Amino acid sequence: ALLNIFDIAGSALAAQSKRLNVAASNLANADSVTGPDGQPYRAKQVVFQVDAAPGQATGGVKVASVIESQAPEKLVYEPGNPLADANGYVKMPNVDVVGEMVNTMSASRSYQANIEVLNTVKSMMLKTLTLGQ
Amino acid sequence: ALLNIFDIAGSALAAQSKRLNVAASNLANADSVTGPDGQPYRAKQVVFQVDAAPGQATGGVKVASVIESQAPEKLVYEPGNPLADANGYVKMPNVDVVGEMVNTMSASRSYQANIEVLNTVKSMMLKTLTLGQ
Amino acid sequence: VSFAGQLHAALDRISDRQAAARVQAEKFTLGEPGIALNDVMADMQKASVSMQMGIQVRNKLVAAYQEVMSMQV
């Protein structure tokens, strides 16, 4: 379907968009006490894999799944909350602020770099077709 | 012997396309952490050789092989990510973004130059075919 | 082996080259992997040059035949 460069750069754009979405969702839920069921929000992470279609030669980036972080959930002593345990510590998400801003900046700069790569390739693509005519 | 220019410039175009593809693959995976085998993505680069069989004076260019770039793997301290080292040193690819962008630009320019060579050569072949007429 | 045989061979070679370029172009348009636009465009270029060569040879050959048939005996 897609040309190889198109597929690689578009996969890069989609992967960076997914990472930015995960960062934004984490930054929104930084102060959430409960979900829809009664469990604390867990910071999400996105794992980049190389989609090496040929044997070890090249390939874009794919995202296998969005994993839930395994870090000590923040404990805040609020015994009056219905979600407090026997000891009374309500669970707050493990979303760090600085890491998510850094992730947003890095995802934006990778997105823009891949956009520039596509823009650069495009002129050569259109100029290839003048070879025959 | 203007026909050999077709082969020379076509080989050059194919080699520059392969180089641009490899550079774009490296750039799109600068943020990757995992490969299909779990290994960290290693930045790769093509090798250019003169496409001359033994006894041939000058030919085009050919891609001998794709080799892993020689650079230290970028160590990141994240001993919370499921992928880690003994001391929590996540290994990230050694992609130098500026180098890859410059490589993409250079490949595009060389590609366009070879296209111009092919165009003017075809024009000359037609004019030669209109020798006496 | 003969002049007619050589002309038939040249026509077959030119047609085979043109058909190969066309088939590769259709394969690329199909979306099948491994076919590069560079090779398609270069092969179309070569096929066009070969067709033009055949046209010129035909033109001259016809001109020479007309010249010979114009001879007064």
Binding site: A1, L3, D7, P54, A57 | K18, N21 | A36
Partner: peptide
């Protein structure tokens, strides 16, 4: 060969 060109159709068919 091992590396497909940038202007080739997705290796993944």
């Amino acid at each position: 060969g091992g590396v497909p060109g940038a202007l080739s159709n997705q290796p993944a068919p």
